[PDB]
A paper describes a structure:
The same study also identified genes essential for growth on nutrient agar using high-density transposon mutagenesis, and found thiamine monophosphate kinase (ThiL) to be essential. The AbThiL structures assume the same two domain fold as MfThiL and AaThiLwith an N-terminal A domain and a C-terminal B domain.
Orthorhombic crystals were obtained from MCSG1 B1 (20% w/v PEG 4000, 600 mM NaCl, 100 mM MES/NaOH pH 6.5) and were harvested with reservoir with 20% v/v ethylene glycol, 5 mM ADP/TPP/MgCl2 added as cryo protectant. The orthorhombic crystal form was consistent for all complex structures and was refined for all ligands. The equivalent metal in the product complex is a magnesium ion as well, bridging between β-phosphate of TPP and β-phosphate in ADP and between α-phosphate and β-phosphate of ADP. A superposition of the product complex and the substrate complex of AbThiL highlighs that the α-phosphate of TMP/TPP, and the α-phosphate and the β-phosphate groups of AMPPNP/ADP virtually do not move. The distance between the phosphorous atoms is only 1.0 Å.
Numbering used by the authors:
A (entry chain B): 1 to 304
B (entry chain A): 2 to 305
């Protein structure tokens, strides 16, 4: 079984009616919805670096899609379709069946179509997914735009996936293996959030991209960070390391005025929202604990 | 480090046809009116899609070229690319040459680099996503070939496959620096009845058209456009390079006699050769000096 049978056997379910031309030709074709901009991103997952080597093939496929839908959500946009480029050393039916199942389970959960890609042989498992979304023209939430006085907020919990990586077997491994892209929240933040980013590297480092892009600073309250009860029971130091520098969260961190935060809380959401601090004028990220300044040194995930 | 790599090598101005380029979670494109998005992605694996010692400039060039080739194969105009690279080491001399190759190909064809992803991985792997636009409904597909249509191919075929086995020969330039036939693809909109780019080998790639169109073809072996160097080698090897070599990135297309006459009236920037015609019998056969010529051909396939 070779390249072309592989595509047909695992990556060629019937295309959505809303896709002008799916898998089968030199490119895919999409008809843009009217009065909307294309939103596009791509992220690579390297075996043994973005996930443990023994990660289940289903989880590998899920996360490959999930982390890229998360980057669409971080813009306020609605995801539409993906391309899948996979390089793998060996043809393993069992692995490919479970991997394609994770691809399609994530796509199906968020209404996304798989419309093309590329399948190659290479010595190390390497997956690049390109994601495409659409957004009302002009309405994208940027990493710039945060203003002094805006609240700093984050969805869900932070630190779960990082704790899980260090405690494989623990229930919190599910947050490492199966992050949830906050797609509907991202769309609900269109027109409310003044800036936004998804927490892939670590909350402090990813907030920092907003602070640099907006030429502002932020003061965070450590005891308001939303952590899992398990992390609430570990020592404070390691708890805040996990929460602020763990990464792999794929939650949304955003800024928002107090008035728009009240409108956001009136909405029906599928995820917890926590206000964790405020944007300030001084161009520094600082931490507060029990009403006093808390010095804290911290580094997020960077390749190389 | 990762963030310095992007800023130093992959962050040239955006440019004008791009609402939001590099620096956010996704890129933003305002679609031109009355046009469909054309999108594709191809992966290059070091030591497999190019000799390990290929210059970084040629690696960058080809990474873009092979993807513009799949846009050209639809009759579409290329617009922008994303670049996903997994690198074992940070090498500034390599990165300078590679990024220069990326941009030299983009600049030659009016294409913007609007985003991507940079990761560490044990083996050099590059996936470019290419985006183009086509007047709605006017894409040239792999289906559509009709009995009586001529089979044509641009340029020369076999050059790159010869160069790969004769590294150091002048024809290595066609391996290292294929030319995507962008303008020709555009000029075949409304003229070609079907089209594919010849990445795997003319016989196999024409085979994809034959299967999608439910027709066959008869090719005239002495009409195949080969380099003078291949004209001087034994004819069996000549035909294997020409028909199963791959890596040509020429356009193979079908066209009515009537529309072929119109194509010739255009001032084209590449040679065009009529090499045979579509027939009812659903087989690819070869003819040489007026008689059937049996030929066993196997084009490129991963895991084969
Ligand atoms: N893993 C994949 N998932 C989805 N579609 C894929 C995948 N690999 C390839 N494809 C699709 O299968 C078709 C054949 O792929 P390919 O032979 O690589 O095309 P080309 O030779 O034009 O680059 C294309 O339509 C491509 O987008
Ligand atoms: N090699 C590259 N070429 C072009 N753009 C790139 C490349 N690598 C990353 N980018 C861009 O740099 C920015 C930051 O990348 P990254 O930190 O990986 O984003 P994210 O964490 O949201 O996935 C993005 O805008 C991305 O599109
Ligand atoms: C085996 C293993 N080691 C380490 C990690 C942690 N990790 C890997 S990548 C990463 C950051 C997210 O990946 P990146 O490539 O930076 O994604 P992007 O910012 O492009 O979305 C983290 C915290 C992991 N998930 N698995
Ligand atoms: C070192 C090396 N070995 C072999 C080849 C030949 N080769 C590699 S890939 C390929 C076909 C084109 O690659 P593929 O991944 O199938 O591209 P696609 O069809 O997706 O465009 C050929 C002929 C090469 N260029 N370099
Ligand atoms: Mg092609
Ligand atoms: Mg990224
Ligand atoms: Mg990302
Ligand atoms: Mg391909
Ligand atoms: Mg990152
Ligand atoms: Mg992001
Ligand atoms: Mg291709
Ligand atoms: Mg191929
Ligand atoms: Na990305
Ligand atoms: Na990444
Ligand atoms: Na492709
Ligand atoms: Na390929």
């Amino acid at each position: 079984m070779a390249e072309f049978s592989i595509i047909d056997q695992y990556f060629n379910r019937q295309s959505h009616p809303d896709v002008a031309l799916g898998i089968g030709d030199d490119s895919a074709l999409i008809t843009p919805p009217p009065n909307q901009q294309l939103v596009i991103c791509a992220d690579t997952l390297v075996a043994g670096r973005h996930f443990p080597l023994e990660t289940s093939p289903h989880a590998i496929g899920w996360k490959s899609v999930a982390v890229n839908l998360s980057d669409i959500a971080a813009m306020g946009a609605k995801p539409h379709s993906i391309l899948l480029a996979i390089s793998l050393p060996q043809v393993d039916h069992e692995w490919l069946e479970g991997f394609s199942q994770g691809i399609y389970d994530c796509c199906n959960q968020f209404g996304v179509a798989l419309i093309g890609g590329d399948t190659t042989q290479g010595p190390h498992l390497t997956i690049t997914v390109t994601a495409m979304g659409w957004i009302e023209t002009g309405k994208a939430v940027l990493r710039s735009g945060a203003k002094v006085g805006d609240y700093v907020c984050v969805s869900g919990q932070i630190g779960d996936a990082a704790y899980g990586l260090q405690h494989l077997g623990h229930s919190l491994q599910q947050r490492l293996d199966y992050p949830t892209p906050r797609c509907k929240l991202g769309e609900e933040l269109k027109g409310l959030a003044s800036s936004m980013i998804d927490v892939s590297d670590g909350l402090a480092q990813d907030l920092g991209h907003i602070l640099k892009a907006s030429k502002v600073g932020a003061r965070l309250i450590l005891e308001k960070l939303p952590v899992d009860p398990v992390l609430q029971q570990i020592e404070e130091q390691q708890r805040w390391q996990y929460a602020l520098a763990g990464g792999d969260d794929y939650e949304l961190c955003f800024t928002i005025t107090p008035q728009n935060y009240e409108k956001l809380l009136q909405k029906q959401l599928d995820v917890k929202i926590t206000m964790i601090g405020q944007i300030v004028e001084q161009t520094k990220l600082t931490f507060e604990h029990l009403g006093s300044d808390y010095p804290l040194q911290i580094h997020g995930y960077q390749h190389f």
